[PDB]
Amino acid sequence: KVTMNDFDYLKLLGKGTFGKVILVREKATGRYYAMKILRKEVIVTESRVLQNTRHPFLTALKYAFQTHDRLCFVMEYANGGELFFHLSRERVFTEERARFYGAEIVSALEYLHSRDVVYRDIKLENLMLDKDGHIKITDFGLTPEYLAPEVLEDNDYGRAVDWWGLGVVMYEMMCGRLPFYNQDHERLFELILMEEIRFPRTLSPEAKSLLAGLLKKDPKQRLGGGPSDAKEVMEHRFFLSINWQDVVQKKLLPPFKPQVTSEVDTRYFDD
Q1: 84 and 176 in contact (C-beta within 8 Å)?
Q2: By C-alpha distance, which of 8, 137, 5 is closest to 76?
C-alpha cells in the first residue's frame, strides 16, 4: 500500500480546478512518477477507466491511493521531455516526423475508442517523449484552446474529437503554428466553427489531404468520424509507409532520440 510518505517532492508539474500534478521520486525504487492529486471536495472518467487501460503510448498509472480528503494517482513520468519543448526548438517537423508521432498517437486512440473510451485531451501539451524517443500521451496540461467544433456548438464529446485533436496537433508539428496562430484570439469560437482552415503551400498533397480530413468541422464527415473509426485514418493516403503492428510494438525507430542515459536521467526536468 503506497502512501504520501513513500515519496520525495521534486516539482510542480501542473495545477488546476481539479487539483494538481507533482513530480515525485518513489523513495524505494528511486524511480520518478507524476502524482496527480485531486480534492475530494471538488468532485470518474479518468479513474479506474484510465487506470486499467494499459498501452505503449498512454501514460501508465502505477499506484492509486487516497488520503482523508484527496485522491492520488501516481503515474509513470516520461523523461524524454515534452513535444511542445521539442517542436518549438525546431519550429517544424518533417512530414515523416509528424507521420511518426501521429501513428503512435493513432495507435493509442484506436485502442481507446475500442474500449468505448473518448480521450477528449489529444493536444500538444499532453504529449511527451520517453527515454527512447517514443510518444507518451500524458494526462494533463504541462496556449489557445482548440476544442472540436461539435464540442463548441453542441457540447458533444464523441469519438470524433480525438481525430480533430490529432488533426490540430498535426497541423502544428508540420506547419509550426496553429491554424489561426495570428488572427486576434477571442475569434476562435467563430473561427474554429465557421472559418476554412488554410494550409501552407509547402505541404505534401497527402498531408494537406490528411489535415483537411482531420479538420472537417462536421464530425460525421471527419476523417475518422466514419463508423469504421480509426481504420479511415490508418488507411488514409498519408499513412502508407505505415506498419501498424510495428507501432504498437515500439518497433519503428524513433526519428529523434532524446538525450538521456537512463529513465533516471533528470535533465529534461528544467527548461
Answers
A1: no
A2: 137
H or E stretch covering 94: none
Task: Tell me the catalytic residues.
Answer: 121
- Contact yes or no for 76/138 (Cβ under 8 A): no
Contacting residues for 149 by C-beta, under 8 A, at least 6 apart:
164, 192, 193, 217, 218
CA-CA distance, 76 to 61, in Å (whole number)? 6
Q: What is the C-alpha to C-alpha distance for residues 90 and 23, in angstroms, rounded to an integer?
A: 26
**CA 203/CA 117 separation, integer angstroms:** 32
Give the CB-side neighbour count of residue 188, counting CA atoms within 13 A. 16
The total number of residues written for the chain in this structure: 271
Distance separating alpha carbons of residues 138 and 73, to the nearest angstrom = 13
Q: What is the resolution of this structure in A?
A: 2.5
**Where in the chain is CATH 3.30.200.20?**
1-81+260-269
Helix, strand, or coil (residue 90) = helix
If you search the block for the grid coordinates 501539451, which residue do you land on? Answer: 125
What experiment produced this structure? X-ray
Choosing among 2.40.110.20, 1.10.3110.10, 3.30.200.20, 1.10.3720.10, the CATH entry for 1-81+260-269 is: 3.30.200.20
